[model samples]
Target: GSQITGTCPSVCSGDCYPECPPGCCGQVNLN
Candidate 1:
């Protein structure tokens, strides 16, 4: 099995998608 996870500033919003700036810990994978 596999999974994906991530973390970002609490103030993040939908507008940040595809353009979440540079330092955002975007995507992660786990198994």
Candidate 2:
């Protein structure tokens, strides 16, 4: 399996949700 990861703003506003897609476990922090 391939591991994909990155950092997204905590206040993403759910916009990246569409771009990022699903089916992956990850974490995002903004501060």
The number of the candidate with the highest lDDT is 1
TM-scores for all candidates: the values are: 0.20, 0.20
TM-score (C-alpha) between model 1 and the true structure: 0.20
Candidate 1: segments with Cα more than 4 A from true spot: 1-16, 28-31
Candidate 1 has an lDDT of 0.45
lDDT of 2 by residue, 1-31 (tens): 9755555444344444544434332543331
Candidate 1 — worst ten consecutive residues by lDDT sum?
A: 22-31
